[PDB]
Copies of this chain bind each other. A is one copy, B any other.
Amino acid sequence: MVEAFCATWKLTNSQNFDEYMKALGVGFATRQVGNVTKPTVIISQEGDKVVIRTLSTFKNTEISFQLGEEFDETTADDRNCKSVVSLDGDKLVHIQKWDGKETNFVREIKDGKMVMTLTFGDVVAVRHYEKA
C-alpha cells in the first residue's frame, strides 16, 4: 500500500529516459540535465493526502494529492497537467493529461527498491531508486 512507498529515495539507475523525454517534447537542454541528475524523492502521508517531494539540481518539485482525486500539476518540464494518482494493487499509478495527451508513471516496490516505469505511447522508461 502507500506505507511501502513512505521514505526517502535516491535514483540509482535510469533506462531509456532520454528517448522518453523526447517523446514528451522535452527540449535538448533540459534533456542533458535530465540525464545526469539523480533526484531524491521523499514520499510521505499528511493525513490521507500523499506528498511527493523531489530534490534535484534542475528543479525542486512538491505535489500533494488524494488517492483517486484529480489535481492540477505543473511538472518539471512545464507541462500543465490534470493528474490523478491511484492504487493499482500494490502499485501507485500516476496519470498526467495535458494538451489532449496522456502519459503515466507506475511506482512499485521490487526487491526493496522503488521501480518507476514511465510510458508515453510506444516509449517506455524505467527508473530505479534505493532507499536512503
Residue A126 lies at the interface, judged by CB distance under 8 Å to chain B: no
Inter-subunit contact B10/A38 (CB<8 Å): no
The docked-state distance in angstroms from the alpha carbon of A63 to that of B62 is 18
Residue A114 lies at the interface, judged by CB distance under 8 Å to chain B: no
| Chain B hits for A46, CB < 8 A | 33
Shortest distance from the beta carbon of A71 to any chain B beta carbon, whole Å: 11
Inter-subunit contact B62/A38 (CB<8 Å): yes
Question: When A51-B57, A57-B51 are in contact, do A37 and B62 touch as well, CB less than 8 Å?
Answer: yes
Residue A53 lies at the interface, judged by CB distance under 8 Å to chain B: yes
Residues of chain A whose beta carbon lies under 8 Å from any beta carbon of chain B: 10, 33, 36-38, 46, 51, 53, 56-57, 59-60, 62-64, 132
